Amino acid sequence: EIISFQHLKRLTCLKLWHNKIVTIPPSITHVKNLESLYFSNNKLESLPVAVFSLQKLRCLDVSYNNISMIPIEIGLLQNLQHLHITGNKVDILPKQLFKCIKLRTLNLGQNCITSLPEKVGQLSQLTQLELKGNCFDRLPAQLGQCRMLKKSGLVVEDHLFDTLPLEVKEALNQDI
Amino acid sequence: FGVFLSEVSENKLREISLNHEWTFEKLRQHISRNAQDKQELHLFMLSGVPDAVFDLTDLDVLKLELIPEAKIPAKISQMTNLQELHLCHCPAKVEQTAFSFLRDHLRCLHVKFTDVAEIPAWVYLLKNLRELYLIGNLNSENNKMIGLESLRELRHLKILHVKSNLTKVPSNITDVAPHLTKLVIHNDGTKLLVLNSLKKMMNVAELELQNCELERIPHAIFSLSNLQELDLKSNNIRTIEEIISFQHLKRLTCLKLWHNKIVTIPPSITHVKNLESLYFSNNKLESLPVAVFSLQKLRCLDVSYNNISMIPIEIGLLQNLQHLHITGNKVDILPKQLFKCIKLRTLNLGQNCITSLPEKVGQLSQLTQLELKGNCFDRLPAQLG
After folding, report:
1. What percentage of chain B's residues is helix, strand, coil (to nearest 5)?
2. Mutation test of the interface with chain A: which of B226, B250, B252, B301, choosing the one with the most A Cβ atoms within 10 A?
3. Which of B47, B257, B280, B325 has the fewest CB neighbours in a 10 Å radius?
4. Do A87 and B155 make contact, defined as CB atoms within 8 angstroms?
5. How many beta-carbon contacts under 8 Å exist across A and B?
6. For residues A70-88, b (16+ Cβ closer than 10 Å) or e, as one string?
7. From the CA of A110, how many Å to the nearest CA of chain B?
8. Contact A159 B277 (CB under 8 A)
9. How many angstroms separate the CA atoms of B36 and B293, rounded?
């Protein structure tokens, strides 16, 4: 009962997994000091829509799930850090994460993504972006603007090391 | 005296001995590999496993080959940087208290090289696997039944891989699983395949049906919308299939097939506009391929292992090609437009005793890999320099 959580407003890192989570309630406004939430072993398809009320979160509760998007709360996340958006099917990803810079882990399995715009080349504070399962053969130029970050999940082969020998080759060769 | 006949009492001494001489000083100096630190150990000789091997903290992969025994306690819960484990002709049926940290953190394996009776079962039901390596396992149609609901259901399952069996459908009703992205199978015997796969496995980015005897490609493969394959290596592909389904699937980006019987390709190869990497070999061709100069995205020239007397005037296509490969021919002439491209990195033209090179090779100053065999090799001009 989240009216009790209105008096328990200092739950800063709520964590709970290995459970029967159907969905999350909309009253998660009632915890302002919350700065990180992460779950696992949850069954869903609908999007968590009450996330933009809480401005402080740095982790997402999105492992062992079934999801098709990241929701419209993307415009207000700035101080966030962790995205283990894993167990999904989506190709599109919204062009929003050039605004937020503090996020450092895109631990995103199961996404055969196609495009990675300026949002992937803007985040200097990031250093990690996991992906397995991909076309991995579009390989955009914004990855050339990624020398501040170091390592991705699977992309380091000669498919990216033969496209664009001036941007990404000089990037991932001056980095090491 | 009757003590020394009982074999379990001798198993006691071999277990105490193999715990004895594998100290930390001996075992921890043995670890060596480059990408991941695989603990090799002579496990065919090791009848019982050691346990001081669990006292090593930078070990993330290791291999088990020909064990009689089964020992792995929850002691390796502490060194939970492990993500995959090789087991081959190897059971380990001790696993109740240790099931949870391998259920979560371990996501991959090499469970190959068994029969169809001694098959580990816990690997079926730990819900967080990503890549399966199940080869050398002679899966008959009574052995199709061992593919059950949990590996049908589970989350992260990237790939699986099957080799050298009588199999034609190991478990393709698994296809509701959300990460089938590379399905690779070996040693087909027939041309039969199940229709449930392509309309429910909506997510394969690769497929490698090596060592088949088909000439068929699934024409109904249009449902899966992000695919970069057609691979049927080691197959007599006589004439290729209906390509307007490949016009629907214009997102074919890495099409490659060889050890084949390609006569010619129809001009529907223009239809895959998003095709950047393409390499063939081992096919009989002398004719000039027609529609090849429409593939603007290209990076490789799929003309390996076929003779050519006159290469076509199609090098006005190659703005951004990256690799040559042209092998087994006799030609001495090449047109001028190769100074258009600066993108290529391999002069890869085997078996051409060509005369010399024009000014266009001075285009490719940043190039570092040149390949030929046989030349006039007497001019060798300064545009190479």
Report:
1. 20, 10, 70
2. B226
3. B47
4. yes
5. 59
6. beebbeebeebbbbbbbbb
7. 5
8. yes
9. 42
DSSP codes of every residue in A72-105: GGGGT--S--EE---SB------TTTTT-----E
Which pair of tokens denotes residue A40?
């696992």
Q: What DSSP state is assigned to residue B108?
A: B
Query: What would the two tokens of residue B37 be?
Result: 């630190």
Both tokens of residue B151?
A: 């590996």
Question: Which residue of B130, B203, B276 is in closest CB contact with A132?
Answer: B130
Query: In this structure, what token pair is assigned to residue B354?
Result: 């060509």
Enter the tokens of residue B78.
Answer: 């502490």
DSSP state of B296: T
Contact (CB, 8 A) for B99 and B120: no
- Burial of residue B269 (CB within 10 Å: 0-12, 13-18, 19+) is buried
For residue B234, how far is the Cα from the chain centroid? 14
Q: What was the experiment behind these coordinates?
A: cryo-EM
**Whole-number Å distance between alpha carbons of B271 and B324:** 22
Q: Name the H helices within chain B.
A: 7-20, 24-27, 99-104, 149-153, 196-200, 244-248
A60-to-A21, B15, B159, B294, B309 alpha-carbon distances in Å:
14, 47, 26, 45, 61
Instruction: Give resolution, Å, one decimal.
Output: 4.4
3-class secondary structure, B209: strand
Instruction: Check B128 against A159: CB less than 8 A apart.
Output: no
Q: Which of B179, B276, B345 sits opposite A137 (nearest CB)?
A: B276
Beta A105-107 vs A128-130: how paired, if at all? parallel
Count CB atoms within 10 A of the CB of residue B208: 18
CB of A153 within 8 Å of a chain B CB? The answer is no
First to last CA, chain B: 86
Among A131, A114, A176, A110, smallest CA distance to A149 is for: A176
